[PDB]
Design a protein around this ligand. Structure first.
Ligand SMILES: [Zn+2]
Length: 173
């Protein structure tokens, strides 16, 4: 079917999102969002992350997994642990992929930086990161800001039913 994404948690629940940023946090495009459910810092009871859509798995490492849709769009999930699938496996929307890591070393098993447990979520097409601007997730339109991680709610927000949800506010599926 047509590529459609859902927020990687259950209907009627909320997590929190930061502002849109590139995969590295510098430069363009703003392809990525950091999601967390507010469980706390390192060592806390971090949640399981659901596949935003169906597709074929690529497992890059113990902390880095991707779901590639039949359309060639894909979502990438970084800072992960307890990964449940291997290369070539098929998953459905909602499938539990793993947890986002509750330990600092596991979260950064391929490098990067982190201030606390979260999943770094990235949209790709043809294996290349692509901008989240004007893309949709759980029927929210994503409006990217004017710099990496920009959380100004006049610049960055999720919009559904004509109402905005800002970064660092309950984002309900
Ligand atoms: Zn990130």
């Amino acid at each position: 079917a047509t590529f459609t994404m859902n927020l990687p948690w259950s209907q009627g629940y909320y997590w929190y999102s930061g502002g849109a940023h590139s995969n590295t946090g510098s430069g363009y495009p703003y392809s990525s969002l950091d999601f967390n459910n507010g469980s706390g810092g390192w060592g806390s009871n971090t949640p399981w992350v659901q596949a935003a859509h169906g597709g074929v798995i690529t497992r890059f490492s113990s902390c880095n997994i991707r779901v590639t849709h039949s359309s060639g769009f894909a979502t990438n999930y970084y800072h992960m642990s307890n990964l449940q699938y291997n290369n070539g496996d098929t998953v459905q929307p909602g499938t539990l992929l793993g947890r986002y890591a509750n330990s600092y070393n596991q979260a950064l098993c391929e490098g990067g930086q982190s201030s606390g447990p979260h999943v770094h979520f990235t949209l790709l097409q043809n294996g290349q990161q692509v901008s989240l601007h004007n893309r949709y997730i759980s029927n929210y339109r994503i409006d990217v800001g004017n710099s990496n991680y920009d959380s100004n709610c006049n610049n960055f927000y999720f919009e559904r039913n004509g109402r905005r949800t800002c970064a660092w506010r309950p984002l309900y599926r």
